[PDB]
Structure formats: structure tokens, C-alpha cells
């Protein structure tokens, strides 16, 4: 998160860090057992975090749980990253509490100017890098489809959205892929990807979680 501010210990409880060793992308809790990211963050070996602020530093909330399944979207296609969404499934059950709690999905689809939550551990830096310990927060606007098929020619398909600030400054950025979107207490977007970080006129592109809500609940039924 590039221009944001630090969110506090435990504030954003359905923020998940995917651990391979290392934190490599964000993600959301769903419910006690199911977390959704970015397809493009999916590897072998994912250990899910909850209950993070510093990674770094156990800190007493943690609870980690290794992956048991990951499913990538059928349609997702790296080259143009349209369908940028995993699901993640826990060996075990999540215990729920306070600060450790799951993002409802969408029951529809948010408006252009709606005012989101954007989270993460990635890069806050624009021309540079330097990783935070602790979760970042941004909040930021949905922009119009126009003005973001306008910023990225060709790109922007029906399963993508851009939130953020065209004037830059204020963006997510590496490492925050995967994690949540947040907009009047749905999860509405992925981190997905974006011209560098909080450039002028190149705002963040998320994936359209909305678009996905059939297919999240009919997957979690059956796996
Ligand atoms: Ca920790």
C-alpha cells in the first residue's frame, strides 16, 4: 500500500497473509474453512495467517493453517489476467472471534464512487521499495469503467474494476495482491495488478468479485 496509513492490530479481521516461507500475497476469509486471492498468487505450499499485524513478530492473535486445496479459476488467463481469482481451502477450521472473522460476499455489484478499504502488506513505495512489518490500509474509490478502460486501453475486461486516484500518490502495490477490497462491508474487489504504483493516471485494477459469487458458493458446496 502506497499513500495509505497503518490500519492497527487486528482491524481488518478477514485479512489473511499466504506464507511460503515468506508473505507473498494477501488474501480474504470467506468462512472458517475457504479464503479468496489472486490466481496469480497461486503456488504450491500456501500457509494461510490470520489474525496478522506484524508479520514478523508473533504477536498472540495468529492462527496459521496450511492450505489443504487451491482451486485457480477455470477462465483465468495469465496473459491478460482476466478471472484473477483462487480459492483457498483451510486443513482445518478457522476458530471465529473478534479478530479473526470472515468478509461477507457481494450481493451485488458496488457503483463507481462507492468509498472501499483496501489492505496489505506490500510495497509502499512508488519509486522504490520498502516493505511494511505491519497491515497498511488505503481507502479509496471505485472509478468508473470508462475512466479505467480509458487509463488502460485494451485491459480492462468485464471482471475487472479500477479503484484509487488518478492523480497517483495513493494505490496498492506489490506484494498487497490477493488481498481485499472492502465496500460498505462487502468484498467487492481482489488486488490484481497495475501499471507500477500510485502512478498518475494508472490507478489499481482489481478483480470483480461480484461477477464470482455464483461460482464461490457452488465451489465451497462441493469441496
Ligand atoms: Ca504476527
Same mark, same amino acid.
Given at each position: ?12 479481521? #478477514? ?196 461477477? #464470482? ?11
Amino acid at each position: 500500500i502506497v499513500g495509505g496509513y497503518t490500519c492497527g492490530a487486528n482491524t481488518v479481521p #478477514y485479512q489473511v497473509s499466504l506464507n511460503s516461507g515468506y508473505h507473498f500475497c494477501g488474501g480474504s476469509l470467506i468462512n472458517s474453512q475457504w479464503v479468496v486471492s489472486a490466481a496469480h498468487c497461486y503456488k504450491s505450499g500456501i500457509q494461510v495467517r490470520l489474525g496478522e499485524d506484524n508479520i514478523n513478530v508473533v504477536e498472540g492473535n495468529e492462527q496459521f493453517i496450511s492450505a489443504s486445496k487451491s482451486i485457480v479459476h477455470p477462465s483465468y488467463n495469465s496473459n491478460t489476467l482476466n478471472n484473477d481469482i483462487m480459492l483457498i481451502k483451510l486443513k482445518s477450521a478457522a476458530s471465529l472471534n473478534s479478530r479473526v472473522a470472515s468478509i461477507s460476499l457481494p450481493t451485488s455489484c458496488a457503483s463507481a464512487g462507492t468509498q472501499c478499504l483496501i489492505s496489505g502488506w506490500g510495497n509502499t513505495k512508488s519509486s522504490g521499495t520498502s516493505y511494511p512489518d505491519v497491515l497498511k490500509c488505503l481507502k479509496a474509490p471505485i472509478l468508473s469503467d470508462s475512466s479505467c478502460k480509458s487509463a488502460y486501453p485494451g485491459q480492462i475486461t468485464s471482471n475487472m474494476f479500477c479503484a484509487g486516484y488518478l492523480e497517483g500518490g495513493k494505490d496498492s502495490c506489490q506484494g498487497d495482491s490477493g488481498g481485499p477490497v472492502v465496500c460498505s462491508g462487502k468484498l467487492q474487489g481482489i488486488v490484481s495488478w497495475g501499471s507500477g504504483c500510485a502512478q498518475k493516471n494508472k490507478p489499481g485494477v482489481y478483480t470483480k468479485v461480484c461477477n #464470482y459469487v455464483s461460482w464461490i458458493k457452488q465451489t465451497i458446496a462441493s469441496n
